[PDB]
Amino acid sequence: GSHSMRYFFTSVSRPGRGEPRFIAVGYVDDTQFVRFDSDAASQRMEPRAPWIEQEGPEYWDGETRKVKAHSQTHRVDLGTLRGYYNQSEAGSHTVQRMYGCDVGSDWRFLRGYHQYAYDGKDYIALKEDLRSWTAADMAAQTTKHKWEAAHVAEQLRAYLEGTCVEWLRRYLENGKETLQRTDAPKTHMTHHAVSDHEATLRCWALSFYPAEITLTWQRDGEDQTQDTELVETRPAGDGTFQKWAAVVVPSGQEQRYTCHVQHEGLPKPLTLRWEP
């Protein structure tokens, strides 16, 4: 739906070399407002967006406290887990966590989610009815049972349906300029002869927000998921994204190829053709 607040935790064990690395990140839609890194000077929750800097010192102190609380939970979790799966003390292992809420175009609660992985694998996810867990294996049933006793989901339902939305709403208001804007992709096309009898047509989308886009090639109006090269979307740095999609054509036959571009910033999709 129209708006989403997510939080991303990674903890990485380093056995020979001290306490696990912990990195927390918060996101409103495709925008990063806060960051904690255990290997960084300040040892504080730091801003990364203009519309969060205005928040008072009660905000930062809180977050710093709670985020250190989170890293301390994760530090235990790497112990318990290594044990559950009986892994040696020798190896690095990764815990990843992701929670937050989506709201819809009226900014009422759409949906909650709270997902946990170990070593890049689904371990335990809270189900969309926000009452029950999905356990990926029988290490993870142990945990589920543990969290069923400790009535965990009940206390997550409180935050996801309440505080999560109510501060999502807040971050949208205080960042109206940035968070509610849509940047249409600026489109052009380039040519590069490749082979004596071949060119490449690279169709470009630049400076778009949010990050959801679709670029397709047609030959004579018939779609070509064939013969094409599509780079995964990527941040400009400046809070906008870029994408390109290339097909390689038989030279003299460029005019036949059209690249088509969808984004919510476009009412009617744009068709672009090679045109010196």
Binding site: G62, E63, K66, H70, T73, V76, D77, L81, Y116, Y123
Partner: peptide
């Protein structure tokens, strides 16, 4: 805003 609940597996 972050949770107040530390979820040890």
């Amino acid at each position: 805003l972050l949770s107040x609940f530390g979820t040890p597996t």
